[PDB]
């Protein structure tokens, strides 16, 4: 509501600026989604964005969003499909509202929305209408079938809203030439699913000539519809259960006889399952038809008639009998599945292609087993929580009735495994997450008997492999977080026992080779790849030496086989970053990559202006590529003898590019480049050419005259960390008058009303005073010059109790502590300057200054008490 | 309230029999309450019918492709028999107790319990009930006695009659029963036209299934009943505007010979030929043919009306309408008459008299046309006249659910009603501002010049808008006509020529070109004699074009001007050459036709190529052939893109195929190397591979190089299938 | 089984599809001819749930593909076949090219003609990817399912049809050995084996609302119109219920597998076209007899109407098809002679269903009579039992 109150602001006085919002504006939503991607109840963060969108337009602030828009759009559309719940459809559908202009991508959900709610209907009605005196002619909009499907279904006269019709007419008749101009012969006949096709039961009545059969369960569509619906009467809900309670029961209740001499016979079958090579009878016998989709129709009933119940049990007020049935259902269905495994043992021990028996015409709980755990990848994660209790009570009863046999390994898992493997391969956000939680509860009761881990080795690794790879950025990272956590534990329990370079036979050899071949795609894929690599190398013996020796054979070719000027560098020099993740091992192909060096020289020497720079995503990748190139060039010089003596100082040419990185002027680039050149480069040599000079002197002329800015002053600041004697220390005192030149009182005249933070000279002045934090240590003239100019500004600012310079004071007294305490005792009279320190000393950066003044206090407590007869008014001061 | 609903119905439930055939009769007669606005208590009636259902608890059947056996497959693999005896692992024994005890408790199910369940389910379950009555209500008809069944069938048709009083009102109540009655396996003995009028009550198409079923169902009860059911369904398929059933059904229901022959002759659109065929059908219907029924007159009757309605001669149709016109006089009021009072008496007569919104549409129409004609007299009741659209909407939710072409008309008028009120302010402000504005009206005029229907839609429709357009264009003239002599549209509202020239292309298309003469005659007396309407009219007169061609030369000799563009006339000159070469006069025609394009600087140029190629088709000698082909493909290079230029290339490709090793024609092709064919030339490309493989790939190498250049990925996939096979067959 | 992990069965994602990129144009969505690829679709991400289904004659593997559009235009997979493909690719080109002109006319497009032959892309010289999606079945599936709705072994009919035929040779000595027996056997077929209206039966349970069966009536004429005009004008001869796939939600008809100058489908060895009676019993007695003739007549008139458009287009296909047939030998005039000789032959055969000249026949008689002639149970019994015409 604060933000909602904040939202109404520039609406309420549009003379009060949107320029107030304008810089924080386009920053906000992009971070908001970024935080929404990061959040742990993000629909809230989504809920703000609508409202913040919900009051704009007619105050011309279009041009700000003109970079931002497709990022929002493409993600929203991808979210829009992914929503898959309820309001988030409509909310994302309401988020289709935007400020005007273009894009058919917006046109895709419109018809999805223009009947997705009554609610939206007025809005998008304006949209296509306004989309229909200008270049609004060439509309090829072929979802026009479904657009026709909604729009004619929209028009309904009754008491419907008299305007709601009145738009719809003005819509439809506006294009009569386009009315049926692509209307189609109807192409959804679309009927007779087995959500419909019930059967009959031989009922009875008190007038009847015979046991007149009555068709049970026509209500299934509505019986599904009523129960899952929120607003049910509890009686109505209970009946929706109770009607379904007879129903899927009766799908096998008539077949639910309790066999008497089968418990020994299944124990005999347990001995017969303990037997193997159990050959079958001599049959080349017959077989009827199937048309097993009609059986799957009957299955998809019992699929849905079951998956309803788990999706009903987790709902409140009726879980009690539900789980009891569900326990009893598992009590029946698993036992029949064991008989079905024995039936699958009768349906086993085939030899070679001759014949078999294959009896027909029954049903079994195999798909019924296969369904509901694969249906645990749903919404309402209490149903996902009961899905944990499934595979628990499954593997409970699995070891209860067959133990830890390989026949017991045959009995339950591979059904649940391969589906969970295939579900891991699947392509929905909500579908994929249900596998991953399933993988964990699997991993508890499977690591004991890890022959399935021997079975699923290159399998389940490859399942993890795409899982981080393929899943899109719509998801919150918690699935990707739950990914690597089980996965490191997976590569743990895999590589927990074999720890030599000796047990390297087949499966882990194939698995690690994919892990090596994965190392090249997404940075989040790239990042935990090395983390899984350098840790798996760290334990179990064979380090990144041995493992990336196999990768050294694997990465000797594509480091030059898919060449540069193509093969996009982020993954590509990510492989060199993987070779930089192999550079901590001794052998990383640690010389002879002059093809990799010289092309990357041209990759950085590709100019950021008047060049391939006219074509936010291209900006982000050119940020990413230049950062990757600046890292890989710097690591190449930093690599052991790879470019330290190769061509002499390749680092200095990389420092020339690092100087060009300083002119590249991106702070996020400059922070990486400064910290790489500080924390990973060490060169102390000479570059006295104009390359140092045309960076050095024009940047100060850029700040003093061209006012350029916050990166530009920070470039020469980081140069002052780097280039020792960036000479003429008085140029900063000349910059100080130049800072005074840029801080004439016209900005103070501009300061009448406006926020001083928004004062870009004050934004310049903060950066200017940030620079003299690390001036050469003759900051004695700094004590004379700036402090007066700060106070003379501050009274001209009419400011108190809060400074722009809270840090530049804090660094300067830290660095200059001797003239600090000197001038402090030397300025022992005046209160205003004293308070300026008294605030700044409260600021905690300089800490030795405080104890120094704590020493000087008892000196000054005398010295002012000495100074007691001085003025009798300033004495009171 | 759940208890209040249940107990009040229970009081009705216990105070009843358990005798279904009585109770169904007690349902079918012995309460016939309306409860009309919501629902039936067919819910409660099925419960009342379940009052006679036994409260049993067995309820089984064997057809779900039933489940696993308890012990059969546990006794079907008999090899390795342990069969242990008092040596049970307790995990086997404890589990075997529980699920059998779980089998002992859980399977408790009754039929009356589910009957209780589905009832409260049906408390909020509409579509289940539509499933529900179709389930039970046929099976109740089994246990019924034959005599009372005939009485119940009367009682059911009487039960069809009693909500035929109750106006219950796309949600099915009757239709709920009706389709539940439709699959009752032919137990509806008279109700042929009874269903026919019942069809427009609500939900057409569920009924029409029952009707076409009886016409196949073999019953001789009357051949009249065979004829009657034939009549009623012949209405309903025509009632839903479905054409091919109607001209389909009667042509397979014919008696007279021209009746069969005319029916096909009309439905294809050969409307003039049907009229004479119906005429001799009528003269023979002045008959000795005794058994003629009301079809053969009335089918012949409105056929005369439709033939009158179609082309022209509306005055003679008004002469036909004089002693006639149930509303054809009001359709003759649709013929152009701006006499306000005479229509007003007609309108008030017409407004006195579920179809005909066109009544209320016309009632608005002249009243709108009058209100602005009193120049800025009114517009407010025209906004009240938008309520006519509000009634007009009630149609488009009555009968269909899909887009049955009932819509295809009902949209076309729903287009107009807005176009009227669109014009209304557009009229009044024009009356205001004339009392700049030439441009502002040129917006809404070009807009209504734009919003024009589909070019193959319906001849009646495209006429009816062309009518309503010019009537506004009259008032458009009628404001412009005094004001320019009042001052002294720079010169001439030439607007309706666009409605004229368009209908001309439509008339040549929809194939009755007599009205194309009738429209072109009306074009004569007009202002705006300057070049712009002249360039439209020469485009109109060429669209208006042996005896007809020599009159075109007679049109060439003295008519409008020779100051205008000669390319249009040279197109007529080469078409006169195309008429001249139609008489096989090749050389005089083509040289004029080559000169006609040479003055023009192209559809004639391709046609003159095509004529010279038709001359090449007649002349297998290459001399005419290579002369035509380089000219024609270059004329095809002159031909427009985004057309059937592809087939023009295709014959040219066939002609390049048809070269049969002539020689030197490709040098003519390479010199006349043409601009971009590629995206149009993209479809014949796999063929273009094989001939370039076969022979003479000179310009074909010139063609395909640029082709793969700007078309990757379509060149790629097939040729990767192809060229890898090609050299492997070559080697 | 029916499905397995497709691209997961590849480690391609880290060696070659570690260069998965470039988001290629939708496969063959330039073949459905238009001007230029304005907004032609781009394939984005292969679905992983591949399906492999096996029909009565063959097997098919299926591959969904949800693209940058985002809807599964699931092209299916055909294992390598023979130069019939190089023929059938050429033919499917040809009948496409007229279909836009079929839309160009008035009453065809006002009644929705739309010839509708599907797309199919070969990618290797080996492998052929047809654009076959789910839920489009063919009749022999139903025809066996009809027999297997019962216990009726269709071979047991085929043996019994063969049984009485050799029994005709034995007891007495008739001269119309085929004719009396096929009159007897088709009756005996309609006695004990497949009667008609099985086709009416199965498809009536197929939709759920009868207006959709009434819809399913309306389409199933309109496609099966075009099979006839495809049959006669190509002079196709072999039609079998495992060669006409029908669209069980839309209603189209997908038909695969389709001197005297080596007449390779030039003359037709039995006279009529396909009008099978169980299919006729589902055809809807009035309305298909109402529509389909009116359909083919409209097809007859409008397509033949414009200037040489049949001809120059047939100049493409026929001059090709003969050069294929003679290679199955060439000549510079004799081909062009046999071109124009056959070109006149088909165009006159096109005009055989042409018109009535001055005396008004009610229909196109050669349509109207052959409507009876294909309906005629003699000429229907006259052909072989290959086409399962007992059904």
From Swiss-Prot, chain B:
The gene is TRA1. Belongs to the PI3/PI4-kinase family. TRA1 subfamily. Residues 193-725 form the FAT domain. Changing residue 304 to R: In TRA1-2. Defects in its ability to interact with acidic activators. It comes from Saccharomyces cerevisiae (strain ATCC 204508 / S288c). Essential scaffold subunit of the transcription coactivator SAGA complex. SAGA acts as a general cofactor required for essentially all RNA polymerase II transcription. At the promoters, SAGA is required for transcription pre-initiation complex (PIC) recruitment. It influences RNA polymerase II transcriptional activity through different activities such as TBP interaction (via core/TAF module) and promoter selectivity, interaction with transcription activators (via Tra1/SPT module), and chromatin modification through histone acetylation (via HAT module) and deubiquitination (via DUB module). This is SAGA complex/NuA4 acetyltransferase complex subunit TRA1. It comes from the Eukaryota. Component of the 1.8 MDa SAGA (Spt-Ada-Gcn5 acetyltransferase) complex, which is composed of 19 subunits TRA1, SPT7, TAF5, NGG1/ADA3, SGF73, SPT20/ADA5, SPT8, TAF12, TAF6, HFI1/ADA1, UBP8, GCN5, ADA2, SPT3, SGF29, TAF10, TAF9, SGF11 and SUS1. The chain holds residues 2428 to 3183 of 3744 of the full protein. HEAT repeats lie at residues 109-146. Although strongly related to the PI3/PI4-kinase family, it lacks the typical motifs that constitute the catalytic site of PI3/PI4-kinase proteins, suggesting that it may lack such activity. The C-terminal domain (2233-2836) is essential for its ability to interact with activators. The FATC domain and precise positioning of the C-terminal carboxyl group are required for stability and function of the protein. It is found in: Nucleus.
